């Protein structure tokens, strides 16, 4: 739904690296190189950013219920 704050397995904070990851991918870097540049060594952390699906961008497209 939205990038988790901590890695499930170990507990490293990965919630502050989603925007940087997208910026790096925008510049043409490969996914492995982008994850390496963010200093994500353990594959337990790498799966958190690699396999995250961002669904909040789909929930936000609905008109807000209040105003």
């Amino acid at each position: 739904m939205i990038i988790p704050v901590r890695c499930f397995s170990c507990g490293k904070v990965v919630g502050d690296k989603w925007d940087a990851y997208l910026r790096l991918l925008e510049e043409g870097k490969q996914e492995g190189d982008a994850l390496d540049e963010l200093k994500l060594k353990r594959y337990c952390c790498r799966r958190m950013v690699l396999t995250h699906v961002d669904l909040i961008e789909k929930f936000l497209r609905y008109n807000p219920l209040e105003k």
């Binding site: 008109n63 807000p64 219920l65 209040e66 105003k67």
Partner: protein, 45 residues
């Protein structure tokens, strides 16, 4: 006495248990109650 919110235009209003269930300005048939004024607390766990 109790607030309500329209389901389309999100317009706040109130009803007196005798008005027809309808938004006053767009005539929508579906309305929602507003959130309670009580305190809501969560354990952050």
């Amino acid at each position: 006495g109790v607030k309500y919110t329209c389901g389309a235009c999100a317009h706040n209003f109130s009803l007196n248990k005798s008005d027809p269930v309808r938004c006053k300005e767009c005539g929508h048939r579906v309305i929602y109650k507003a959130r309670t004024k009580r305190m809501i607390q969560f354990d952050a766990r």
